[PDB]
Amino acid sequence: GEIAKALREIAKALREIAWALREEAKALR
Amino acid sequence: GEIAKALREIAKALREIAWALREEAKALR
Amino acid sequence: GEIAKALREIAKALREIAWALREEAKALR
Amino acid sequence: GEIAKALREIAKALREIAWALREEAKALR
Amino acid sequence: GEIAKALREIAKALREIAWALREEAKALR
Amino acid sequence: GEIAKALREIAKALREIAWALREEAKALR
Amino acid sequence: GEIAKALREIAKALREIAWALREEAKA
Known part of the structure; x- marks a missing residue:
């Protein structure tokens, strides 16, 4: 219900x- | 209800x- | 109730x- | 209750x- | 249920x- | 209950x- | 239950x- x-x-x-945090972790490396 | x-x-x-985290991410060029 | x-x-x-996370993003950029 | x-x-x-996030945002400043 | x-x-x-926060840390260090 | x-x-x-985030703000500053 | x-x-x-935030602050 x-x-x-x-x-x-x-x-x-x-x-x-x-998803937004996994993107930030990629960008940081 | x-x-x-x-x-x-x-x-x-x-x-x-x-949404704020997406902007933090983008927020580091 | x-x-x-x-x-x-x-x-x-x-x-x-x-709001606080948006302010964090504005402070880096 | x-x-x-x-x-x-x-x-x-x-x-x-x-409150802790607002403080970090001032620290980044 | x-x-x-x-x-x-x-x-x-x-x-x-x-898991995503741990990965942010490892990307830095 | x-x-x-x-x-x-x-x-x-x-x-x-x-607590963990207040300590991160104290360090940044 | x-x-x-x-x-x-x-x-x-x-x-x-x-715990993950503590490990982030160590870095």
Whole structure:
């Protein structure tokens, strides 16, 4: 339901943050 | 309904943190 | 209710982290 | 109640993270 | 059930963020 | 209960992240 | 029990993030 959907949307935004950090780690090397 | 809406608000804030990190990354020429 | 209001306070605190990260990016460039 | 209080405590810890990031942004300056 | 599964997806995305932060450190050093 | 106890543990892990970031700001300065 | 277990798993991943930040500051 709606609460579980919103928690999955939180997990996706956290994966979005991880993609940006993996990009920064590439650029730093 | 208010609980699910506040969780979606948390996901939106986390997407805003991802956007700020993309700009930090780009932010080193 | 009280749980919804506390979740809204968590979203506000995450928006305060996004502002700070944007300021970090502006300080390097 | 105890769940709502713990959620408010998570929001307080996130504000401590924002405060430390704001300080780093002034340090980079 | 579905709420518990979504919380586990959140923990895994946080583990991805930790791996990316470790890699930023290693790129520097 | 067990849920409130786990939420308090999440708040302490976030205070632990803020300690590490305050030390990084103290060093930069 | 499964929701509380998943919340403790989140706290453990946050402690792993605090450890990675300490290692970033050493560099």
